Amino acid sequence: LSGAIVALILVIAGVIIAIAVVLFAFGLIPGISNQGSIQVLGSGTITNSTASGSSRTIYNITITVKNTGTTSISVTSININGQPFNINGTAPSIPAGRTQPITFEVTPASGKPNFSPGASYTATIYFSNGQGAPATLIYQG
Amino acid sequence: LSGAIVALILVIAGVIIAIAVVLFAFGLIPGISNQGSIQVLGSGTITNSTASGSSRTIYNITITVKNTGTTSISVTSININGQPFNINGTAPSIPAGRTQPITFEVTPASGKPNFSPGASYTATIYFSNGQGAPATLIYQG
Amino acid sequence: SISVTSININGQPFNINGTAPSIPAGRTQPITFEVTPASGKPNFSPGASYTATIYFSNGQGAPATLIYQG
Amino acid sequence: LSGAIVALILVIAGVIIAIAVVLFAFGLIPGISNQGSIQVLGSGTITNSTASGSSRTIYNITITVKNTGTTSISVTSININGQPFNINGTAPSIPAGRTQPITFEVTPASGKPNFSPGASYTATIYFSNGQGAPATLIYQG
Amino acid sequence: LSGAIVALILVIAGVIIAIAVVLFAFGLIPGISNQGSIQVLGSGTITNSTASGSSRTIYNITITVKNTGTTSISVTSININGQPFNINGTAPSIPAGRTQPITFEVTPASGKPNFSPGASYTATIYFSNGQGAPATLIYQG
Amino acid sequence: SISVTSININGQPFNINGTAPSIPAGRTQPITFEVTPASGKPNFSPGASYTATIYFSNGQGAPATLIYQG
Amino acid sequence: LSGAIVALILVIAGVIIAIAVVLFAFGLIPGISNQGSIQVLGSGTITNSTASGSSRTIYNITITVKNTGTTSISVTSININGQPFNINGTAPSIPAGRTQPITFEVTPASGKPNFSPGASYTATIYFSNGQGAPATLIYQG
Ligand SMILES: *[C@@H]1O[C@H](CO)[C@@H](O[C@@H]2O[C@H](CO)[C@@H](O)[C@H](O[C@@H]3O[C@H](CS(=O)(=O)O)[C@@H](O)[C@H](O)[C@H]3O)[C@H]2NC(C)=O)[C@H](O)[C@H]1NC(C)=O
Ligand SMILES: *[C@@H]1O[C@H](CO)[C@@H](O[C@@H]2O[C@H](CO)[C@@H](O)[C@H](O[C@@H]3O[C@H](CS(=O)(=O)O)[C@@H](O)[C@H](O)[C@H]3O)[C@H]2NC(C)=O)[C@H](O)[C@H]1NC(C)=O
Ligand SMILES: *[C@@H]1O[C@H](CO)[C@@H](O[C@@H]2O[C@H](CO)[C@@H](O)[C@H](O[C@@H]3O[C@H](CS(=O)(=O)O)[C@@H](O)[C@H](O)[C@H]3O)[C@H]2NC(C)=O)[C@H](O)[C@H]1NC(C)=O
Ligand SMILES: *[C@@H]1O[C@H](CO)[C@@H](O[C@@H]2O[C@H](CO)[C@@H](O)[C@H](O)[C@H]2NC(C)=O)[C@H](O)[C@H]1NC(C)=O
Ligand SMILES: *[C@@H]1O[C@H](CO)[C@@H](O[C@@H]2O[C@H](CO)[C@@H](O)[C@H](O)[C@H]2NC(C)=O)[C@H](O)[C@H]1NC(C)=O
Ligand SMILES: *[C@@H]1O[C@H](CO)[C@@H](O[C@@H]2O[C@H](CO)[C@@H](O)[C@H](O)[C@H]2NC(C)=O)[C@H](O)[C@H]1NC(C)=O
Ligand SMILES: *[C@@H]1O[C@H](CO)[C@@H](O[C@@H]2O[C@H](CO)[C@@H](O)[C@H](O)[C@H]2NC(C)=O)[C@H](O)[C@H]1NC(C)=O
Ligand SMILES: *[C@@H]1O[C@H](CO)[C@@H](O[C@@H]2O[C@H](CO)[C@@H](O)[C@H](O)[C@H]2NC(C)=O)[C@H](O)[C@H]1NC(C)=O
Ligand SMILES: *[C@@H]1O[C@H](CO)[C@@H](O[C@@H]2O[C@H](CO)[C@@H](O)[C@H](O)[C@H]2NC(C)=O)[C@H](O)[C@H]1NC(C)=O
Ligand SMILES: *[C@@H]1O[C@H](CO)[C@@H](O[C@@H]2O[C@H](CO)[C@@H](O)[C@H](O)[C@H]2NC(C)=O)[C@H](O)[C@H]1NC(C)=O
Ligand SMILES: *[C@@H]1O[C@H](CO)[C@@H](O)[C@H](O)[C@H]1NC(C)=O
Ligand SMILES: *[C@@H]1O[C@H](CO)[C@@H](O)[C@H](O)[C@H]1NC(C)=O
Ligand SMILES: *[C@@H]1O[C@H](CO)[C@@H](O)[C@H](O)[C@H]1NC(C)=O
Ligand SMILES: *[C@@H]1O[C@H](CO)[C@@H](O)[C@H](O)[C@H]1NC(C)=O
Ligand SMILES: *[C@@H]1O[C@H](CO)[C@@H](O)[C@H](O)[C@H]1NC(C)=O
Ligand SMILES: *[C@@H]1O[C@H](CO)[C@@H](O)[C@H](O)[C@H]1NC(C)=O
Ligand SMILES: *[C@@H]1O[C@H](CO)[C@@H](O)[C@H](O)[C@H]1NC(C)=O
């Protein structure tokens, strides 16, 4: 007598679980939309900031960043013209909804890159979303 | 003795329902074809079609539409420049195999659109077969 | 051995005129058969490709693409 | 005992349907080739072809068209200077492998076009194979 | 006492049948999971083989073919420029793991081709697995 | 400890030449074993990917991808 | 009682098989994800190697080739000016990570070339990966 009751319970539960899975599938997508929260807009600038040889060739990156997400997002790493770079201070963070000029100091990860006045160098800024925004920096130092 | 009888009933019912589900999966296929029956050809035209002191602005929209299905299909909604528009009157029907310049009247639902003479606007035409088609509309006046 | 029972072309059902072809087991063949529209009239265009579904005696249905040659 | 039987049925059906979908994906490919069968060669000519007091203006349009496919293809719509035009009469057919000067009659659908003698107009010719071709038409009178 | 023993019998039998179905599912994997395919490398050539004024047109098709699988595979059909062709004669077989220049004769299944010297035609070659490789064939005359 | 009972590579059966390798409990380790074609002579191309199903003593059949390197 | 235990068996087995398929998907990545390519740098040269009035025409082809990948790659065919050529002899192999001047002899697969001194001909060199590099070859005589 129990078999029919077990089958009934499993049928109804299967309906419920399938509907729950369907809803979860859609519930995923607003999370994934955060992968493109940030846009880097306008031409940035890179400037010599080394203090006449008193620092390990530390440069200044200024870029206008727009954040459309609901969370503050920070710059985790930067690559300039193929070369890795390391942020010298604490990472800048862009608040939600803002469009603002982020400025941060940077160091060569290896070697000593030489820049020419007025040249354009492509840099990829990697933000905490994992999003990598390409941008163009004009050297001004 | 009851349990074996119940198990027999449930086994046969499971066979029947599983076969029915498989056949339904096979039967779904023909309905998919109709999702692409229509394609919009070339640019279209928006025109201002409202009188002085009228309650509402109404725009005549003309687009060339090609239907490839067996059945007549009609427009259900249009979204121009991001704003959704509401279709006035009886929506035009596009005959089964014909290519026709179709014209229909729309009125803004979200807010007043500031169309500019001679400007080009992106739009999405949504047809009754559940198909959306990109289109480019020139505002003639 | 398996035989055709119906075909649906461009969302329109067609009836398999005549003795429906039978496909022998384990064999690859060119199969040709005549069909008539169950209702209405087709709007085929030369060179166009139409999605169809061919339904066989097991109830299984194979989707296919048919080009109209005129 | 029912669940294992149902699972067996569904597993085999899934194998069958997945293989069918893969074969359909492979079978779609030949239809893509026909989308580029036709190319328009050189400039064309528009001419005024309506009598006094007629209900409508009708323009003869002549264009050289080259067909490379196995099947005859015909014109379905034309869009001149942004305005869509409606093709009068039986649309001309372009034989499979031939290059021909084709002529057809059109009438304006959106509104009266103010063609200027000797002017050059951009147009898009839309053919029955779903292909659009840019063309340049000189208005001869 | 009967109910408990019957329920235990059905529980053990359900375990048996479920494990059998699971092992069947595991055994299906080798048949469906079959990597490797025939890859068509570079452009092939179509050459007119019809001779002596005989009634039937035959064309040589030469293509470079690389069988990445572990099984012998043969050509079953070809579609050129939207037109189907029949593989005249014993269809060529491509040995496993081998890259070969493969040449075979074809005849039009219907109609007549419109090939032009030096033109490039998109074709699809269908192999015994049902997979179909798109290729480009240049007509050499 | 669980052992490799049989292997199928790209649909073709294969036979282990030595004693079957055995994976101890809780371990993650590289199993390496010799194999022979059960029938025929399969030919592999450098850098190609071949799917193989390894059947373990549990009856579990794990699909995996092997890249030919010889 | 049988139904619940059978359902639990199938749930666990489904977890097992699904995770196995996911791991297979992860294992496919290295085979498909293969960066690096053979790059043809600058213009190459075609020189007439036919000598002694022998019946078969042979041409020297010299090109600068940079293998950016981690695998040895060889040429398989070349197409010059729309005409296929066969790589006479043991086809040259390009070692990994190396830039080399590569030279190989070719013969026309059909017909005869029409090369003119000083003319530049577009060619396509097909390598063992199936990738094909376009190049420009100058005929030096
Ligand atoms: C940005 O400004 C920097 C400072 O003007 C430039 O780098 C300096 O370049 C000079 C010559 O190229 C080099 O001598 C400096 O090096 C160091 O010198 C120190 C002594 S002193 O020169 O300061 O008196 C040493 O103590 C030290 O060990 C040396 O490494 C060098 N300075 C640094 C910090 O590298 C730089 O060229 C300029 N432009 C860019 C794009 O960076
Ligand atoms: C590939 O070769 C084919 C054979 O030469 C070409 O087809 C032939 O095309 C010519 C016209 O271009 C046509 O006259 C041939 O038709 C036959 O002609 C015979 C007499 S003769 O012409 O040989 O002197 C007749 O006896 C016969 O009844 C005709 O059918 C025609 N041949 C066929 C078999 O169709 C074809 O043009 C060429 N190119 C391509 C792209 O196929
Ligand atoms: C590259 O070199 C080729 C070989 O010298 C050139 O082809 C030769 O072209 C000449 C005419 O320009 C032609 O006469 C050759 O044909 C043969 O001639 C022999 C006699 S002799 O000419 O050597 O005195 C005959 O015995 C023989 O049967 C002919 O076939 C011809 N050679 C070949 C193999 O075709 C070619 O023009 C040159 N340039 C290019 C762009 O290929
Ligand atoms: C480079 O960026 C830094 C900010 O990180 C700027 O440094 C500031 O300089 C002003 C005076 O010019 C000081 O009052 C601030 O305290 C500095 N801030 C930090 C964090 O050091 C600098 O001005 C920028 N421009 C350069 C170096 O040319
Ligand atoms: C907009 O379209 C409407 C119909 O969709 C057109 O209305 C007709 O206009 C003509 C005169 O132009 C009248 O004779 C008809 O009685 C009107 N009604 C119908 C149902 O045809 C209108 O002309 C169009 N307006 C513009 C500016 O294009
Ligand atoms: C379309 O033309 C009509 C007039 O025929 C315009 O309607 C009125 O225009 C005046 C002046 O801008 C406004 O004060 C009224 O409010 C308008 N009426 C309505 C109902 O909007 C109308 O603005 C024109 N629309 C466009 C897009 O040009
Ligand atoms: C426009 O094209 C039409 C047909 O598409 C032409 O109509 C023919 O005109 C000639 C005289 O010019 C008559 O003898 C024929 O009876 C007409 N009909 C057909 C079907 O040929 C017309 O000539 C063209 N007009 C212009 C101005 O080019
Ligand atoms: C083409 O020529 C015809 C005359 O053969 C023109 O038709 C009439 O022209 C008068 C004067 O402009 C107008 O009042 C009528 O309304 C016109 N009739 C029609 C049906 O439009 C026509 O305008 C000419 N078209 C072009 C583009 O030149
Ligand atoms: C086309 O391919 C066929 C073979 O598939 C070639 O036919 C051979 O031609 C040679 C030369 O006359 C004969 O010795 C052989 O007996 C033929 N074999 C067959 C099977 O027909 C033909 O030469 C090829 N043509 C071209 C232009 O490549
Ligand atoms: C074309 O390349 C071939 C080699 O690929 C060269 O042939 C060599 O020629 C030299 C000089 O006569 C001989 O010593 C060698 O034995 C030849 N080797 C081979 C493999 O043929 C040929 O010289 C080159 N020609 C040009 C003009 O560069
Ligand atoms: C680097 O960052 C530190 C703080 O972390 C700051 O005091 C310093 O001025 C920055 N620049 C240099 C050249 O050290
Ligand atoms: C909207 O459409 C209806 C029916 O076609 C028509 O009667 C009405 O006049 C239209 N709106 C306006 C403002 O004219
Ligand atoms: C089917 O078509 C053929 C023509 O090829 C005709 O002879 C036959 O009568 C038709 N039969 C039916 C049932 O439509
Ligand atoms: C429109 O096309 C038809 C079909 O050829 C023709 O009879 C008719 O006259 C054309 N229109 C005019 C105004 O002549
Ligand atoms: C195929 O073509 C060859 C010509 O090379 C001819 O000898 C043979 O009879 C043809 N066979 C068929 C079935 O078309
Ligand atoms: C196969 O296994 C045996 C041991 O069973 C081993 O000695 C031998 O080297 C292996 N390979 C060959 C090629 O025999
Ligand atoms: C390739 O050309 C060379 C001439 O340098 C010749 O010795 C050799 O026999 C040719 N080989 C082939 C297969 O044509």
Residue numbers in the entry:
A (entry chain Z), B (entry chain Y), D (entry chain b), E (entry chain X), G (entry chain a): 16 to 156
C (entry chain U), F (entry chain T): 87 to 156
Please quote the authors directly:
Within Sulfolobales, member species encode for three types of T4P, namely the archaellum, the UV-inducible pilus system (Ups) and the archaeal adhesive pilus (Aap). Whereas the archaellum functions primarily in swimming motility, and the Ups in UV-induced cell aggregation and DNA-exchange, the Aap plays an important role in adhesion and twitching motility. Here, we determine the structure of the Aap, and show that it is solely composed of multiple copies of AapB. Each AapB subunit consists of an N-terminal α-helix tail, followed by a globular (head) domain.
Here we present the structure of the Aap pilus from S. acidocaldarius at 3.2 Å resolution. Aided by the building of an initial atomic model, this map was sufficient to deduce the helical parameters, which we identified as a helical twist of −39.9° and a rise of 15.4 Å. Careful analysis of the filament’s structure revealed that the AapB monomers exist in three distinct conformations (henceforth designated as conformations A, B and C) These differ in the angle between the head and the tail domain with values of ~112°, 129°, and 121° for conformations A, B and C, respectively. Each distinct conformation repeats along one of the three left-handed 3-start helices of the pilus, meaning that each of these 3-start helices harbours exclusively one of the three conformations. In conformation A and B this hinge is short and lies between G51, the final amino acid of the α helix and I53, the first amino acid of β1. In conformation C, the hinge region spans from I53 to I47, across a stretch of four additional amino acids where the α-helix is “melted” into a loop. Moreover, the distinct hinge of conformation C causes the tail domain to stretch out, meaning that it reaches further into the centre of the filament. The glycan densities originated from asparagine residues, (N48, N60, and N88), which were all part of a consensus N-glycosylation sequon (NXS/T). While all six sugar units of the hexasaccharide were resolved in the threads, the map of the Aap contained only densities for the first one or two sugar residues.
